[PDB]
Amino acid sequence: KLVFFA
């Protein structure tokens, strides 16, 4: 579902 990489 959610994958965030900053």
**How many DSSP helices?**
0
Taken from the alpha-carbon principal axes, the silhouette is rod-shaped
For the termini, the CA-CA separation is 17 Å
Give me the secondary-structure category.
little secondary structure
**Major sheet, described briefly?**
none
Number of strands: 0
Strand content: under 5%
Computed over alpha carbons, the radius of gyration is 6 Å
Helix content: under 10%
Site (Cleavage): 1-2, 4-5
Protein name: P3(40)
PDB class: protein fibril
Keywords: protein fibril, alzheimer disease
Could you please describe the fold and organization of this structure?
- Helices cover 0% and strands 0% of the residues.
- The protein contains no helices and no strands.
- The termini are far apart.
Explain the layout of strands and helices:
Elements lengths: L6
Key features of this structure:
6 residues, little secondary structure, 0% strand, P3(40)
Quick synopsis:
The protein has 6 residues and is low in regular secondary structure. Helix content is 0%, strand content 0%.
